[PDB]
Amino acid sequence: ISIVEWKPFEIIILLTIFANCVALAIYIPFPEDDSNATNSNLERVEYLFLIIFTVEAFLKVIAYGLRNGWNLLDFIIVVVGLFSAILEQATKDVKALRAFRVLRPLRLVSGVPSLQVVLNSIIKAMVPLLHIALLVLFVIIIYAIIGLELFMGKMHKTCYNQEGIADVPAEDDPSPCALETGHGRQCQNGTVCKPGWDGPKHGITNFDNFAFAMLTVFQCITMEGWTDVLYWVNDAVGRDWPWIYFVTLIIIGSFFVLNLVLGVLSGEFSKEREKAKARGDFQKLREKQQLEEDLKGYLDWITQAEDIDPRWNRFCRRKCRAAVKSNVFYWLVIFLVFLNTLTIASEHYNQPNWLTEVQDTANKALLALFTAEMLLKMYSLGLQAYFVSLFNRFDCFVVCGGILETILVETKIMSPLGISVLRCVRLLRIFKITRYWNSLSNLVASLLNSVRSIASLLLLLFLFIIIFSLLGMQLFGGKFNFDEMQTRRSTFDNFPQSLLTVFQILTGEDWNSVMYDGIMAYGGPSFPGMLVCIYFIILFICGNYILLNVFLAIAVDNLADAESLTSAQKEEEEEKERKKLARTASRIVNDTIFTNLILFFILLSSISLAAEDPVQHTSFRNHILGNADYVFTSIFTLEIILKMTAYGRNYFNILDLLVVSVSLISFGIQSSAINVVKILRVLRVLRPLRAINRAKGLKHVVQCVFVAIRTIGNIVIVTTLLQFMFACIGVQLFKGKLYTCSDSSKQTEAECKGNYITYKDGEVDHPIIQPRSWENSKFDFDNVLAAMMALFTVSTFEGWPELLYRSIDSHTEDKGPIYNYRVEISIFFIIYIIIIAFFMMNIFVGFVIVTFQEQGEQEYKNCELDKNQRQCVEYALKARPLRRYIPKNQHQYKVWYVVNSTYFEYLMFVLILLNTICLAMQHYGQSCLFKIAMNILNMLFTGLFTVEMILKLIAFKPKGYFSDPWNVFDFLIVIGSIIDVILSETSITFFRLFRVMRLVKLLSRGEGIRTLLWTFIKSFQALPYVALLIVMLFFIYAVIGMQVFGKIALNDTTEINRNNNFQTFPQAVLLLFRCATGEAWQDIMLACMPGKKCAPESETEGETPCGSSFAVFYFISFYMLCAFLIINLFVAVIMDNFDYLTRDWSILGPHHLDEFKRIWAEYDPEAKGRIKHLDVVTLLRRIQPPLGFGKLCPHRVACKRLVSMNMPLNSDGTVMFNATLFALVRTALRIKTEGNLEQANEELRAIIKKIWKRTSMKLL
């Protein structure tokens, strides 16, 4: 019984769990205690489910008498279920603790054991991501205290009219202003900046205390709605200083933390790859490839001799086999597939009548030919030889689908969805002529071999989304019903809608807009109501982790196997071909000063180009640097002339000519405004690029990026090919359907003319006449190019929820929207994001990582010296003892003993934390007593810290105190905090930001953090030219945008406003930074479309001549290029720091030997390294075992062995430091034998690590 269980008592319980999961989805949360019959039936099925669970709990309890975590989860689920049922019966919130049933779907993981393994693989590589979760916590706290000492309470005023107010006439979205004494936004002509305002977003986005700032900093770190906060601060305090906060916050907490996380994950995924390689899981894929090749390579013997004729069907088969494989049916079927793609991609909205007949007759004349080829494939090759090859099973699928989908279209049952578009996948056969086919086939082979892993990793992601959908639906079900007219399409009302909302939060787009709604649904910016943001924070930070541990893992662990498979094929082909052939047949220009001065002049010209006035034309600034170009080109013209005589042509020299030329052929037009000038000026922007050839190190990175982009071409091509098919499907589904009338009552263009009355702010007593306009969506699936653009801006995760809910409403061509007509059409978008936004954009990053790893693994000197032994011997050869400065004076000795110990350091580490806590309690609306208490507390803390500084200066003396890098930054904080006090007793805030900087001392202590940060910082410093490509790209694109879109008028109702414009180089760079962050960049692109008003200053013809059609190729290309360059820099840093990222810490290394160096300490002061004799005899006693030894007996055979390890060329009296080092390194690992003393000296000297005679101190 209590052991009888059985086997079928689990499978029954699992089915009950699934039934509970389904019954939890049909439930509909109603707004205000409403209900229907289905909910009443589910409330009684819950009783049966609880009875079953209680019976299970009791039976399992009496078999064991529960220590397992899963059993504990079951127990605490059933107990709280009983509690909820009893409380509901008693009270006849009780209906809030039913949110423990959304935890029942977790029992599915308990049931199937193939998912427990994957769940452990998921939350086991999270422990490494705990030194990057603490750095994030420190950065958020530091920036929240800094923005609290800078922006506390400064965003509580807005324009209010000068009549009957209390309303904010600052338009539908009010923005903070400033009184006419500061430098913030000034109210309009007929408005007044008055205090007494709630806040920018109902009071949730503020810096009023260390609860509202900790959330604003997190939201800005997630790179969502950070420009909104930056602009709100810009409209409240000024525009000069606030950008330094929000730019550094994202550079450090969103572009460096992301790099750290990516590096740790990519180094963590390589250890398991090594473990699998040691176990030998790649062999199974290796054998399957060759055996399948031979199992198809030997079928020709059967098929070529199946029709031996010693009735007469040989008439055709003896030539059908040749004809269909004679390089004619290849280039003819490819041509037919090209024609089919032509007829599929030529369908737009409102096409001519002949085109729809051409595409109706070709779609049949080509299907007939493909079916004829189908029957010929079955005949000339045989049935089995047809269904061997993978491409030959998908082609049968496509042809049978075409045949079965013509019927549905001709019989008028369902509307076309796109089926023949899968025939364009056959265009991949073009790769067979080049070498980019073995890798592509191998990648698909690995993807198909790993299916029980992909479909199992996606199952936990689906379970996560389902669980967080039911929990969110219980929390916010029906509570999003606000009085305002907006329907709030992203709610938690049903299961499909709550799934869409959770998926949108997972992608991250507008994740803060849903949380701002879930906060007001539980009250407002109050204490208990706002504790609901923990749901969204946890969902975001635990969904974007599984989204990087499920997709990047697949991409990396499959693309690493694909490379090994391709290498195997290449090696086998090379060996076989080699065997076959062998077996069968047997001037002052070149000076430094000129180059350096020309490089300096290049920078001068670039800065002169970046300082031009975009909007203004007749200005003095556009004259001086419009005149310095005259002299500037004179030097550059000269430079070519006297260097021409040294030659009689490299491509860089041709570029420098071109450049010098434009300039030249420009101030000579001196008349032809006729564009020309204005299309020859936007070509000076090539100046920076003439420094590539004169800045060796900058040419190398350009060449490396060119090799990288040549290598990654297959991924881009097969991603564009897939996006094309998705665009064609979108055209089939949504052509001419996403049209809307301004009046939401007319569903026809002929019905959408005239005017209509709209009521402002949903007030029936405030009528307003507005015109009726039949308008399309911002991005529409009308033709194939518009579909491509819309899908691109969907894959960038920008504005995709708007397009999704506009596509859901569309029902018929030339008709308006219908609320939630086809919600099921969201599957198209979900699939697109899953494939083209989560999988294919991670395959590219995995490919970059794998290629860089292969480049780094090329030879590595390939000569012994195990991967740690290089550093071990290098350190044993270039390690010197460290200074200690034991005080000589007897009093200074006691003082330095006081400040050198755990007590003083750990008490300072407590005072620092107390000071930060005291800095954290700073609300908006503090009493005078609170503030004057804070002042005295700050004075006391700074007095204590300056007394600590005095003590340290006295103990360590002024060279010793100042030598430590951490005691020179402590001096600056003390001076700033000591200037702060005196200036507070009568630019004062610049010194108030010094005290909060003392918190970094706590981040300094403790390994892990201090090692990862240092290694990544020195990796960023080791590659200063990879990060200069991004600077060059930003400069060039900012100048181009400045020249093109400079003159667009700044209306605050559009996306080119006072805050976002191209009218200055800093502002253009900020706009490009925002676009790189991916913050409504498509809105800026649309606001830069042709047909806008020019600025009043920039010069009738001025109807709408501002804005160019260049915006598409500007913004899309900038996005792609910036993403490529950022990923290049990230992976370059990761691979430069790939020793720390995978170190296998159970072995010796820098951690186990820098300890040594220290452990020498005592037995040494200033350098020297001479032993006490009694050190070599007390060693192990402190040294740790996994490196040296474990506190055991000095004569332990193994420790006496440490004595057997004797003089390595020195003197027993005083070991020359390094001595013991090597000795300990040699005994720890790579133990050699007797007589291998100069043999080791040549084991290093003969290949690498030039000794430089140093063996004078190490011989034997």
Ligand X SMILES: CCCCC/C=C/C/C=C/C/C=C\C/C=C\CCCC(=O)O[C@H](COC(=O)CCCCCCCCCCCCCCCCC)COP(=O)(O)O[C@@H]1[C@H](O)[C@H](O)[C@@H](OP(=O)(O)O)[C@H](OP(=O)(O)O)[C@H]1O
Ligand Y SMILES: CCCCCCCCCCCCCCCCCC(=O)OC[C@H](COP(=O)(O)OCCN)OC(=O)CCCCCCCCCCCCCCCCC
509 labelled binding-site residue: yes
Shorter beta-carbon distance to ligand CLR: residue 543 or 1169: 543
Shorter beta-carbon distance to ligand NAG: residue 849 or 1094: 1094
Asked if 1051 is part of the footprint of ligand NAG (rule: CB under 6 A), the reply reads yes
Asked if 1209 is part of the footprint of ligand X (rule: CB under 6 A), the reply reads no
Tokens of 1169: 């390294």
Asked if 785 is part of the footprint of ligand CLR (rule: CB under 6 A), the reply reads yes
Asked if 625 is part of the footprint of ligand CLR (rule: CB under 6 A), the reply reads no
| Cα diameter, the chain | 117
| Interaction partner, residue 1073 (ligand NAG, ligand Y, ligand X, none; CB < 5-8 Å by kind) | ligand Y
Residue for token pair 């191998």 = 442
Asked if 140 is part of the footprint of ligand X (rule: CB under 6 A), the reply reads no
1243 labelled binding-site residue: no
| Closest residue to bound Ca ion by CB | 509
Shorter beta-carbon distance to ligand Y: residue 356 or 1051: 1051
Out of 124, 288, 894, 1010, the only residue in the binding site for ligand X (CB under 6 A) is 1010
CB of residue 1097 to ligand NAG, shortest distance in Å: 15
- Degrees, nearest 5: CA angle 848-849-850: 95
Query: 3-state class of 770 per DSSP?
Result: strand
Query: 3-state class of 959 per DSSP?
Result: helix
Shorter beta-carbon distance to Ca ion: residue 229 or 264: 229
CB of residue 969 to ligand Y, shortest distance in Å: 24
Closest by CA to 580, choosing from 588, 572, 569, is 572
Torsion of CA 573, 579, 580, 584, to 10 degrees: 180
Taking CB atoms within 8 Å and a gap of at least 24, the contacts of 866-874 are 866/1229, 866/1230, 867/1139, 868/1147, 868/1148, 868/1149, 868/1229, 869/1225, 869/1229, 869/1230, 870/1249, 871/1149, 871/1150, 872/1148, 872/1149, 872/1153, 872/1225, 873/1222, 873/1225, 873/1244, 873/1249, 874/1249
Instruction: Report the alpha-carbon distance of residue 472 to residue 738 in Å, rounded.
Output: 30
Asked if 341 is part of the footprint of ligand CLR (rule: CB under 6 A), the reply reads yes
| Interaction partner, residue 52 (ligand CLR, Ca ion, ligand NAG, none; CB < 5-8 Å by kind) | none
Q: What is the DSSP string of 283-302?
A: HHHHHHHHHHHHHHHSHHHH
Q: Where are the beta strands (DSSP E) in 1015-1070?
A: none
Asked if 146 is part of the footprint of ligand X (rule: CB under 6 A), the reply reads yes
Out of 425, 611, 933, 1095, the only residue in the binding site for ligand CLR (CB under 6 A) is 611
Instruction: Report the alpha-carbon distance of residue 780 to residue 863 in Å, rounded.
Output: 60
Residue for token pair 């606001």 = 1087
- CB 1106 within 8 Å of CB 1048: yes
Q: Give the side-chain half-sphere CA count within 13 A for 563.
A: 17
Q: How far is CA 644 from each of CA 593, 594, 654, rounded to the nearest angstrom? A: 18, 15, 12
The percent helix, strand, coil of the chain (3-state, each to 5) is: 60, 0, 35
- For ligand CLR, which stretch binds (CB under 6 A), given 144-152, 370-378, 783-791, 1131-1139? 783-791
Shorter beta-carbon distance to ligand Y: residue 1073 or 1189: 1073
Shorter beta-carbon distance to ligand X: residue 858 or 1021: 1021
Shorter beta-carbon distance to Ca ion: residue 509 or 780: 509
**DSSP state letter for 881:** P
- CB 942 within 8 Å of CB 970: no
Out of 538, 665, 676, 721, the only residue in the binding site for ligand CLR (CB under 6 A) is 538
| Interaction partner, residue 665 (ligand Y, ligand X, ligand CLR, none; CB < 5-8 Å by kind) | none
| Interaction partner, residue 1051 (ligand Y, ligand NAG, ligand CLR, none; CB < 5-8 Å by kind) | ligand NAG
Whole-number CA gyration radius for the chain: 36
Tokens of 694: 């004169």
Asked if 1233 is part of the footprint of ligand NAG (rule: CB under 6 A), the reply reads no
Asked if 490 is part of the footprint of ligand CLR (rule: CB under 6 A), the reply reads no
| Interaction partner, residue 522 (ligand NAG, ligand Y, ligand CLR, none; CB < 5-8 Å by kind) | ligand CLR
CB of residue 1035 to ligand Y, shortest distance in Å: 8
Binding mask 772-811 for ligand NAG (x = CB under 6 A): ----------------------------------------
Out of 1053, 1146, 1233, 1256, the only residue in the binding site for ligand NAG (CB under 6 A) is 1053
Asked if 396 is part of the footprint of ligand CLR (rule: CB under 6 A), the reply reads no
Instruction: Report the alpha-carbon distance of residue 530 to residue 202 in Å, rounded.
Output: 12
Q: How far is CA 954 from each of CA 69, 371, 904, 958, rounded to the nearest angstrom? A: 56, 94, 15, 8
Buried b (16+ CB within 10 A) or exposed e, 972-1010: ebbebbbebeeeeeeeeeebbebbbbbbebebeeeeebe
Instruction: Name 612's Cβ contacts closer than 8 Å, sequence gap at least 6.
Output: 621, 622, 625, 626, 1042
Out of 163, 483, 824, 1007, the only residue in the binding site for ligand X (CB under 6 A) is 1007
- For ligand CLR, which stretch binds (CB under 6 A), given 125-133, 144-152, 643-651, 1063-1071? 1063-1071
Asked if 142 is part of the footprint of ligand X (rule: CB under 6 A), the reply reads yes
Instruction: Report the alpha-carbon distance of residue 177 to residue 174 in Å, rounded.
Output: 9
Shorter beta-carbon distance to Ca ion: residue 224 or 235: 224
224 labelled binding-site residue: yes
Shorter beta-carbon distance to ligand X: residue 416 or 1150: 1150
Alpha helices in 866-964 (DSSP H): 869-877, 890-898, 902-920, 928-963
Q: Which stretch of DSSP H or E encloses residue 38?
A: helix 37-64
Instruction: Name 1068's Cβ contacts closer than 8 Å, sequence gap at least 6.
Output: 1038, 1039, 1041, 1042, 1062
Shorter beta-carbon distance to ligand Y: residue 238 or 1190: 238
- For ligand CLR, which stretch binds (CB under 6 A), given 37-45, 697-705, 1061-1069, 1108-1116? 1061-1069
| Interaction partner, residue 1004 (ligand Y, ligand X, ligand NAG, none; CB < 5-8 Å by kind) | ligand X
Binding mask 332-371 for ligand X (x = CB under 6 A): ----------------------------------------
Out of 413, 534, 674, 982, the only residue in the binding site for ligand CLR (CB under 6 A) is 534
Stretch 487-526 residues interacting with Ca ion (CB under 5 A): 509
Question: Which residues of this chain interact with ligand Y, rule CB under 6 A?
Answer: 183, 238-240, 243, 247, 1030-1031, 1034, 1066-1067, 1069-1070, 1073
Out of 182, 1150, 1190, 1194, the only residue in the binding site for ligand X (CB under 6 A) is 1150
| Closest residue to bound ligand NAG by CB | 1051
β-bridge mates for residue 755, sequence order: 771
Count, residues near ligand CLR per rule CB under 6 A: 25
Tokens of 983: 């200036």
CB of residue 284 to ligand CLR, shortest distance in Å: 39
Shorter beta-carbon distance to ligand NAG: residue 1107 or 1149: 1107
Residue type, 781: F
Q: Give the side-chain half-sphere CA count within 13 A for 449.
A: 21
Asked if 1014 is part of the footprint of ligand X (rule: CB under 6 A), the reply reads yes
| Interaction partner, residue 1053 (ligand NAG, ligand Y, ligand CLR, none; CB < 5-8 Å by kind) | ligand NAG
Residue for token pair 């089919």 = 340
Instruction: Report the alpha-carbon distance of residue 371 to residue 203 in Å, rounded.
Output: 66
Which residues of this chain interact with ligand NAG, rule CB under 6 A? 1049, 1051, 1053-1054, 1093
Annotated binding site: 224, 509, 798
Which residues of this chain interact with ligand X, rule CB under 6 A? 139, 142, 146, 241, 244-245, 248, 252, 965-966, 969, 1000, 1004, 1007, 1010-1011, 1013-1014, 1150, 1154
Annotated binding site for Ca(2+): 224, 509, 798
Which residues of this chain interact with ligand CLR, rule CB under 6 A? 341-342, 345-346, 348, 522, 528-529, 531-532, 534-535, 538, 606-607, 610-611, 783-785, 1031, 1035, 1064-1066
